[PDB]
Design brief:
2 copies of one chain form a homodimer. The first copy, chain A, has 554 residues and is mainly β. In chain A, a hairpin with a 7-residue loop joins strand 21 and strand 22 (274-275). Bound molecules: calcium ion (2 copies). Chains A, B: Keywords: Disulfide bond, Host-virus interaction, Viral attachment to host cell, Virion, Virus entry into host cell.
Chain lengths: 554, 554
């Protein structure tokens, strides 16, 4: 819906000041502290302050561990979602490791974890990376480390052949059944801001409700997970004895081998005796210190299930291109230059693909910077050359690197929108509600209602504006005319849309007779206007930008 | 030895310029681009350029891998020596691992390496650290990784009891002899700029002379070493047979157990036969598909030596506090501010303990900075806000953090010395040869000869100087008088010690009648003098420093 805005008057000039005590900036390169009239889409301006972000060359060494900032982990610095998961797949090989490990056959043995590839890619929002330097199972590198192996049920042991001297059946580890049934562990998902916990079996009424098993280390991007039910089968041998009996010559041995006992046939020439043929598989053990005291039986095989829960950790991170943000502004009658870096900045690769800044005009600024068109980005709170806070986000690929789209995303996820770029001139000056009011960064009902300023048709449509929402006004600079004999004017719009005013500054911009400086850089703060004017020579060479300060009567 | 220096004259002033277009600096905080007359010991000045180094807060995450810069590894960035070494100590435990590993009983088994603690401490010059995240042998973390296990001689195998069906003696791994002899590996020292190599057995005349075994990765601080002769003993069993013979009823078995053979006694009721008692230890194997075809013998134990060479890598680093260097200078009639960072600078902890800068007056500078009084330091080559090169050193503890001592050390190891601080006034102006000549940073013969300037007694002994060796002169600023009615003068000394000149600048420093500005900041470049004068109010409050430029007639 459209809303007419009447021109209520012309604010006169109360004073004009020069600014000849500042670093010289090339009219060809731009002002280091004053935003150009073409940069409204990069700001939520608050004064004569300018920012610029640069991206450092980077490699796989510049890592950002997954340290999620949550109610449970308020010290984390990652705002983007990430939910990796995987399983311990059961097969002869992995089962070997688990078996040798739980039975103490070798404490170095460990099964390799199988992460779900897609969960690591994380939809590229952002693309995550597994830190394979975190651990190694022998010659194999892996981003996962099994912390605890817990058999669901006590590990069984098989008996051995009775001891010659003791006549006692020993013990040994069951034997993995190669052609047995393998069950994969359940789904193991990593958590970073709390420990893995199992319901306290005694919960109602005794505390605590849950029992922590293992803990993650979010600062190092280490998550914690539980992979239940890893299963495989083993063969257990139980010694099942059969009676041993004696007979003596002349009695004869059975015509057929014995199957339910062993018979020992004694003679005169051999009072000790010799056993009658017995079914293969039967084991006879003659006690050495009393051969006439032997026992017999078989080591019968039994198939059994071995289930184990495995708790493990995983190390993750994403690439994070070091940044360098220049933050310069005017104050105390001089220019304050400030620089700050994030990460191990080395050499500049380029300027940041996207960057929007909300400033207070005094070195204060909260910004959103994405080195690329998608992926890792930083929501940064800063003051001068000091980084107060940093929270990372990720720009979805579905934005196709669209400034307009990104603007809305940043608006919706971070409450930031370039309020300084709404003014435009076609047949008349116009600006959507959102920017004019400059209070709600998000799109919404009435947010796109158009405020059209009556009596502004004389201005050129190619005029460019950068506005400053302060107090009752939205002050935007750069209403230019097709006729240079007509000096640029500053526009003062009421944020309630009641009406607007212009401020003719033809005098302040007057260099020669019938010749004025154009407004190319503009800012408004504390009721003071700051102007920057491009400059060149008769020949056409770039010169230092002209800086003035103009105070309007309000 | 002393050398008289006559006053040859007074250079007049050819021109005076003001500098009112620069950032305001507090007379209480200092000039951001002009070295104070009290900072000669911090520079080898070349113009109106000032540097300052800050140290960032740091923890164990700020690591500097041991990457030595050598003819073989010119891309390395470490100049300090480091020679870690250790051994693989032989004992039942480590031997177990080596045995199970070389015989393939388990490829995850590995012996832990024992580094020589003192070699890691490295005399604290600097203190090195082992990266235990590099590898793990099961639950144990270790900065070392065995790459190759190479038995000095083919691994022996012991025979087993002949197979029932096949009647063939098998094989199995020898048995480690617990109470055996253990030999430690030889001395294993890590190298970083080349691979470990063994003489090519065929060298004369066939190439290459040596054979690379394993390679280090200096960029990651990974060294490579060879630990020869790790030794332990094992018991090997060789199947030594004895003949098997038959006899038949009525013949009788020997009265005593057989010790050199086995006798099988057949009968009518048992055509197969029963063996006559035989010495314990003897093993009889009756072929199942022909019991009358059995063999006998013993599994005789033999002690043997097992030696193995182990090649391994180790990951090392030292703590490296991120740095931030401000580099500002005057040029093109304005002040050029530049900042640069090294490492992941976060928050400032303090100013660098020690720092000396050789400047060219145009943003160019090569410096030596040590965040602390001893330890890791950086030799840095820079231009404006760009780090050209960085080479790390370590300041020996034996310097006790002595500026004077450090100065000499830096002089001797890096060819850098604060040439700007030699001038001094007692009864007369005086300066050692080294600084006056400003060509050889190191101490040496004649380097401490004193040049005394005649006719300079009127100056105050509390005068402070910062000199600039350029072309034929050593221009130092700040010859002050006890009587303020007498303005400061700049001293121009000939580097060949032929004589000196003064430059009276009472006019340029004249603010009021019978009142002048004192020279508090000074620099000389391209025949132009740059002055900074402290300022205050009648009340005594700090004001902006006054800056002028004075050209002398030469
Ligand atoms: Ca337009
Ligand atoms: Ca003195």
């Amino acid at each position: 819906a459209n809303f007419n805005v009447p021109k209520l008057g012309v604010f006169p000039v109360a004073a004009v000041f020069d600014i000849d005590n500042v670093p010289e900036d090339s009219s060809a390169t731009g002002s280091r502290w004053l935003p150009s009239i073409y940069q409204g889409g990069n700001y939520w301006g608050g004064g004569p302050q300018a920012l610029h972000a640069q991206v450092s060359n980077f490699d796989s060494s510049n890592r950002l561990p997954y340290n999620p900032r949550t109610e449970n982990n308020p010290a984390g610095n990652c705002a983007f979602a990430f939910n990796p998961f995987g399983q311990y797949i059961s097969n002869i090989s992995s089962a070997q490791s688990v078996h040798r490990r739980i039975y103490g056959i070798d404490l170095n043995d460990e099964p390799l974890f199988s992460p779900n590839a897609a969960s690591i890619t994380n939809g590229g929002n952002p693309t995550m990376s597994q830190d394979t330097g975190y651990h190694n199972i022998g010659p194999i590198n892996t981003a996962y480390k099994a912390e605890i192996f817990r058999p669901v049920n006590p590990l069984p042991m098989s008996d051995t052949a009775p001891d010659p001297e003791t006549l006692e059946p020993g013990q040994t580890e069951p034997l993995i059944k190669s052609d047995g049934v393998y069950s994969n562990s359940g789904i193991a998902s990593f958590i970073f801001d709390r420990p893995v916990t199992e319901p306290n079996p005694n919960w109602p009424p005794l505390p605590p409700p849950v029992i922590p098993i293992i803990y993650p280390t979010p600062a190092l991007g280490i998550g914690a997970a539980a992979a239940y039910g890893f299963g495989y089968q083993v063969t257990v041998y139980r010694w099942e004895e059969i009676p041993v009996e004696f007979i003596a010559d002349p009695e004869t041995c059975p015509a057929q081998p014995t199957t339910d006992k062993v018979i020992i046939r004694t003679t005169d020439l051999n009072p000790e005796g010799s056993p009658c043929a017995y079914e293969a598989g039967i084991i006879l053990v003659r006690q050495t210190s009393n051969p006439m005291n032997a026992v017999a039986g078989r080591l019968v095989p039994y198939v059994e299930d071995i289930a184990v829960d495995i708790f493990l950790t995983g190390k993750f991170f994403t690439l994070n291109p070091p940044l360098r943000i220049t933050n310069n502004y005017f104050a105390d009658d001089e220019v304050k230059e400030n620089t700050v870096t994030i990460g191990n900045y080395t050499t500049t690769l380029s300027s940041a693909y996207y960057a929007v800044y909300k400033t207070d005009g005094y070195g204060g600024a909260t910004c959103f910077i994405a080195s690329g068109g998608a992926g890792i980005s930083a929501l940064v709170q800063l003051q001068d050359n000091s980084v107060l806070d940093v929270l990372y986000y990720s720009l979805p690929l579905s934005l196709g690197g669209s400034k307009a789209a990104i603007d809305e995303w940043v608006a919706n996820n971070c409450g930031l929108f370039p309020m300084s770029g709404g003014l435009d001139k076609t047949t008349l000056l116009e600006i959507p509600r959102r920017q004019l009011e400059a209070i709600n960064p998000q799109d919404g009902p009435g947010q796109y209602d158009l405020f059209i300023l009556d009596d502004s048709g004389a201005y050129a449509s190619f005029s460019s504006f950068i506005g400053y929402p302060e107090a009752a006004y939205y002050v935007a600079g750069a209403a230019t005319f097709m006729d240079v004999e007509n000096p640029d004017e500053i526009i003062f719009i009421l944020r309630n849309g009641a009406g607007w005013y212009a401020c003719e500054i033809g005098d302040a911009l007057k260099i020669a007779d019938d010749e004025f400086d154009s407004v190319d850089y503009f800012a408004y703060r504390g009721g003071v206007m700051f102007i920057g004017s491009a400059r060149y020579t008769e020949g056409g060479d770039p010169l230092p930008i002209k800086y003035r300060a103009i105070i309007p009567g309000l």
